[PDB]
Design an enzyme around this catalytic site. Structure first.
Site, PDB file in Angstrom:
ATOM      1  N   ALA A   1      -5.765  -4.349  13.208  1.00 15.68           N
ATOM      2  CA  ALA A   1      -4.394  -3.924  12.970  1.00 15.68           C
ATOM      3  C   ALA A   1      -4.032  -4.223  11.526  1.00 15.68           C
ATOM      4  O   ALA A   1      -4.717  -4.985  10.835  1.00 15.68           O
ATOM      5  CB  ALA A   1      -3.409  -4.618  13.918  1.00 15.68           C
ATOM      6  N   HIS A   2      -2.950  -3.599  11.078  1.00  9.67           N
ATOM      7  CA  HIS A   2      -2.309  -3.921   9.812  1.00  9.67           C
ATOM      8  C   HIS A   2      -0.850  -4.235  10.102  1.00  9.67           C
ATOM      9  O   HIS A   2      -0.175  -3.471  10.799  1.00  9.67           O
ATOM     10  CB  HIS A   2      -2.430  -2.771   8.810  1.00  9.67           C
ATOM     11  CG  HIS A   2      -1.786  -3.054   7.488  1.00  9.67           C
ATOM     12  ND1 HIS A   2      -0.489  -2.689   7.200  1.00  9.67           N
ATOM     13  CD2 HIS A   2      -2.259  -3.673   6.381  1.00  9.67           C
ATOM     14  CE1 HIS A   2      -0.190  -3.069   5.970  1.00  9.67           C
ATOM     15  NE2 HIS A   2      -1.246  -3.670   5.452  1.00  9.67           N
ATOM     16  N   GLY A   3      -0.370  -5.354   9.576  1.00  5.15           N
ATOM     17  CA  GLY A   3       0.989  -5.772   9.846  1.00  5.15           C
ATOM     18  C   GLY A   3       1.703  -6.270   8.611  1.00  5.15           C
ATOM     19  O   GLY A   3       1.240  -6.035   7.490  1.00  5.15           O
ATOM     20  N   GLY A   4       2.835  -6.954   8.808  1.00  2.00           N
ATOM     21  CA  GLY A   4       3.586  -7.473   7.675  1.00  2.00           C
ATOM     22  C   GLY A   4       2.777  -8.424   6.817  1.00  2.00           C
ATOM     23  O   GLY A   4       2.897  -8.422   5.589  1.00  2.00           O
TER      24      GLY A   4
ATOM     25  N   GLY B   1      -0.359  -8.247   6.357  1.00  2.00           N
ATOM     26  CA  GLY B   1      -1.535  -7.558   5.865  1.00  2.00           C
ATOM     27  C   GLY B   1      -2.499  -7.182   6.974  1.00  2.00           C
ATOM     28  O   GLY B   1      -2.151  -7.131   8.157  1.00  2.00           O
ATOM     29  N   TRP B   2      -3.742  -6.918   6.573  1.00  2.00           N
ATOM     30  CA  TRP B   2      -4.776  -6.555   7.534  1.00  2.00           C
ATOM     31  C   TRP B   2      -5.121  -7.745   8.422  1.00  2.00           C
ATOM     32  O   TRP B   2      -5.152  -8.892   7.968  1.00  2.00           O
ATOM     33  CB  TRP B   2      -6.037  -6.066   6.816  1.00  2.00           C
ATOM     34  CG  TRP B   2      -5.906  -4.716   6.175  1.00  2.00           C
ATOM     35  CD1 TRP B   2      -5.777  -4.450   4.841  1.00  2.00           C
ATOM     36  CD2 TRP B   2      -5.887  -3.444   6.840  1.00  2.00           C
ATOM     37  NE1 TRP B   2      -5.684  -3.094   4.635  1.00  2.00           N
ATOM     38  CE2 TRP B   2      -5.746  -2.454   5.845  1.00  2.00           C
ATOM     39  CE3 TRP B   2      -5.978  -3.047   8.178  1.00  2.00           C
ATOM     40  CZ2 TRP B   2      -5.691  -1.093   6.147  1.00  2.00           C
ATOM     41  CZ3 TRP B   2      -5.924  -1.691   8.476  1.00  2.00           C
ATOM     42  CH2 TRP B   2      -5.780  -0.733   7.465  1.00  2.00           C
TER      43      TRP B   2
ATOM     44  N   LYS C   1      -5.698 -13.875  10.393  1.00  5.94           N
ATOM     45  CA  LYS C   1      -4.388 -13.316  10.096  1.00  5.94           C
ATOM     46  C   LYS C   1      -3.789 -14.034   8.897  1.00  5.94           C
ATOM     47  O   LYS C   1      -3.931 -15.252   8.762  1.00  5.94           O
ATOM     48  CB  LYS C   1      -3.454 -13.448  11.302  1.00  5.94           C
ATOM     49  CG  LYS C   1      -2.069 -12.866  11.095  1.00  5.94           C
ATOM     50  CD  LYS C   1      -1.248 -12.985  12.364  1.00  5.94           C
ATOM     51  CE  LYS C   1       0.166 -12.462  12.172  1.00  5.94           C
ATOM     52  NZ  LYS C   1       0.920 -12.472  13.457  1.00  5.94           N
TER      53      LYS C   1
ATOM     54  N   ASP D   1       9.986 -16.119  16.141  1.00 11.06           N
ATOM     55  CA  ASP D   1       9.754 -14.694  15.919  1.00 11.06           C
ATOM     56  C   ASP D   1       9.436 -13.942  17.210  1.00 11.06           C
ATOM     57  O   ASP D   1       8.657 -12.987  17.212  1.00 11.06           O
ATOM     58  CB  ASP D   1       8.637 -14.478  14.898  1.00 11.06           C
ATOM     59  CG  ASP D   1       8.658 -13.082  14.293  1.00 11.06           C
ATOM     60  OD1 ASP D   1       9.738 -12.455  14.273  1.00 11.06           O
ATOM     61  OD2 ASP D   1       7.593 -12.600  13.859  1.00 11.06           O
TER      62      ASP D   1
HETATM   63 MG   LIG Z   1       5.795 -12.570  13.082  1.00  9.32          MG
END
Ligand SMILES: [Mg+2]
Ligand SMILES: [Mg+2]
Length: 672
Positions: A60-63, A65-66, A83, A179
């Protein structure tokens, strides 16, 4: 061990078994739909990170990064996640920075992803957290897999209930999750797992809290995280799982939508109330902890399954005792007695309503065990000499035990004054608000009682007792103004409200103009008071078949709205096994001839009475009431007789026939 769907929430919801993806279908192609601005991955298959993790690819790619997947070369066969991890202040004491990361590693709970390491690779600036790979879709993916993008409300509550133990594990250790949102809750096989471990901080921690706008509580930026701010994200998450919330530039709009603009909240208003309390702007007005929220979720889930599926479960987690008596069951039937208007009274309602269960954590709890069976004058004295003890200075059961003793002695005015004395210290406690509502109800101040009972319902949205109390107070308000025969609502709204069906969803928001945006219970407008009394009785009756006081209350509100057919249907659901069955059968007969007379209703009433044995003492007086209705209907219609030659009982359904029949029945009555 691949399995079937599993029961949760005392068997009220079944969560599906999610089959994990095959381990050769976990990696995503970085080039497929390459978003704007996102760079290619820095690491590729075969790269070794911190001489222990063999990179396999990205998932996945998220806030941050990868997100890479890698073999852990120190545990044969284990795959882990790499992560991006949030850096710290770079100015705090070095030990304190190491201690916070060693605390994330030691967190041990089956509902939380395990952290294995914290590393920094020079090809990827920012450092990694190394954590367990959880094979399953996120709750966000499960929503997108549905055509309308939302989970069924009872399934979403089941998922929330499954993650609450992990939330409470953190809270009891002095840390918060921060979160919580659908995309970091993963459903795998038969368990629910939290994966955003890198966001965990201590309660009231300085620094930028890595929450998500649209889920984070408003006070976090200025005051820091708390148990209450986590509760806030639970309410926002639950809202996001169940309805298409308005989005402003990728950010969920604040607040819970109005039930005027939400079919789901319109059908399940206690679910609406729960979401309000969990996401309250003031942290003081939120659930204090997870167990507090858990208790109301069970009650709200019960009312959801009753309204939607007709499933009825016994209350297992209530903060109240069961019903102690009934009220208004003999109201309509007793008015035909021969022997000056009978009415539903406040002491009759209070004697039926439950009492709060004694809190065992209270120090003075042992002083109150036995207060119900003992003489109230003695209980008052024993509880008073207890307040002379410093160990009971902070007790809440003892002072409210004094209030009950005063109310049991009939000293209602002293009970109100003593509640006023306690307002400063314990006024926030819902049990203080509950007895304030009881006391003002006994003083016949129905407007004030409505305010206090609404406060209780706000705090305990899943409890049946405040809803029945509110329904009875609203009925007493309408009785005070003589509205038990006046209709205020259109037949379409009454029909939809009485059944709590999809018809209540089909109505447009213009039908609820008189209600506030949050459908507030506080009102003196008879239109709103009638709407709430009708709906609350309907909800309590559909949810608790033993609370027969709501069945008769529902029929009474329906009768005022000229909906005799629905009123009859409501009381016909009272089972033959109930001791109130005979009363319900006689009441339905009298409902048929109470208002809006027609030949069909009069003839149906008579044929129903004929099914009742002549042994019934009130048989003859009900028969007179029916024949009197037939004569009154004939005279109002200016009809000599009905079209049919079929008799009413044994007499012709004519003005001459029923006059004879009434006179004959009256003389049988007068000689009895
Ligand atoms: Mg989070
Ligand atoms: Mg393996």
């Amino acid at each position: 061990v691949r399995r079937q769907s599993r029961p949760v929430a005392d068997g009220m919801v079944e969560l599906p078994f999610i089959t994990p993806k095959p381990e050769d279908e976990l990696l995503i192609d970085p080039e497929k739909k390459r978003k704007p601005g996102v760079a290619a991955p820095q690491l590729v298959a075969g790269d070794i990170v911190a001489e222990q993790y063999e990179v396999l690819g990205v998932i996945a790619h998220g806030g941050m990064g990868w997100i890479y997947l890698a073999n852990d070369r120190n545990v044969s066969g284990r795959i882990v996640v790499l992560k991006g991890m949030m850096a710290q202040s770079s100015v705090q004491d070095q030990g304190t920075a190491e201690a916070e990361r060693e605390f994330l590693a030691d967190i041990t709970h089956p509902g939380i992803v395990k952290a294995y390491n914290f590393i920094d690779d020079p090809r990827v600036p920012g450092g990694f957290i190394v954590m367990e790979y959880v094979n399953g879709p996120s709750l966000k993916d499960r929503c997108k897999a549905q055509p309308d993008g939302v989970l069924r409300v009872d399934l979403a509550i089941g998922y929330i209930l499954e993650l609450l133990p992990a939330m409470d594990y953190l809270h009891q250790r002095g840390v918060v999750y921060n979160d919580l949102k659908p995309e970091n809750v993963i459903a795998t096989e038969d368990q629910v797992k939290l994966i955003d471990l890198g966001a965990v901080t201590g309660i009231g921690a300085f620094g930028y809290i890595y929450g998500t706008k649209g889920f984070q509580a408003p006070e976090v930026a200025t005051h820091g995280p708390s148990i209450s701010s986590d509760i806030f994200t639970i309410g926002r998450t639950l809202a996001a799982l169940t309805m298409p919330l308005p989005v402003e530039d990728g950010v969920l709009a604040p607040g819970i939508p109005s039930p005027k603009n939400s079919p789901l909240l319109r059908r399940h208003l206690s679910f609406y109330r729960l979401l309000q309390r969990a996401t309250a702007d003031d942290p003081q007005h939120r659930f204090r902890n997870v167990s507090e929220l858990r208790t109301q979720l069970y009650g709200v889930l019960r009312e959801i399954l009753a309204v939607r599926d007709g499933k009825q479960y016994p209350p297992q987690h209530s903060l109240f005792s069961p019903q102690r008596s009934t009220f208004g069951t003999k109201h309509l039937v007793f008015r035909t007695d021969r022997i000056r208007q009978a009415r539903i009274t406040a002491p009759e309602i209070v004697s039926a309503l439950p009492v709060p269960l004694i809190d065992r954590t209270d120090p003075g709890a042992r002083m109150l065990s036995g207060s119900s069976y003992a003489e109230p004058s003695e209980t008052l004295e024993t509880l008073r000499n207890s307040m002379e003890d410093e160990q009971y200075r902070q007790s809440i059961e003892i002072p409210l035990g004094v209030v009950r003793a005063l109310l049991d002695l009939g000293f209602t005015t002293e009970a109100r004054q003593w509640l006023e004395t306690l307002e400063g210290r314990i006024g926030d406690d819902w049990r203080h608000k509950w007895f304030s509502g009881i006391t003002y109800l006994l003083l016949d101040d129905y407007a004030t009682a409505q305010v206090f009972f609404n406060h209780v319902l706000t705090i305990l949205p899943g409890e049946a007792a405040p809803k029945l109390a509110l329904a009875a107070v609203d009925e007493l308000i309408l009785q005070q103004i003589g509205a038990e025969s006046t209709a205020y609502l259109t037949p379409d709204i009454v029909s939809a409200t009485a059944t709590l069906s999809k018809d209540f969803e089909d109505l447009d928001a213009s039908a609820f103009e008189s209600l506030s945006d949050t459908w507030s219970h506080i009102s003196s407008d008879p239109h709103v008071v009638r709407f709430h009394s009708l709906r609350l009785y309907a909800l309590v009756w559909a949810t608790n078949p033993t609370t027969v006081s709501s069945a008769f209350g529902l029929a009474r509100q329906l009768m005022a709205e000229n909906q005799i057919e629905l009123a009859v249907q409501a009381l016909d659901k009272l089972p033959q096994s109930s001791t109130h069955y005979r009363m319900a059968t006689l009441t339905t007969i009298l409902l048929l001839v109470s208002s809006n007379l027609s030949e069909s209703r009069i003839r149906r009433a008579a044929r129903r009475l004929t099914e009742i044995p002549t042994n019934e003492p009130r048989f003859n007086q009900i028969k007179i009431a029916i024949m009197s209705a037939g004569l009154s209907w004939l005279r109002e219609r200016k009809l000599k007789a009905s079209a049919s030659a079929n008799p009413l009982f044994e007499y012709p359904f004519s003005q001459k026939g029923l006059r004879t029949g009434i006179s004959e029945a009256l003389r049988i009555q007068a000689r009895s």
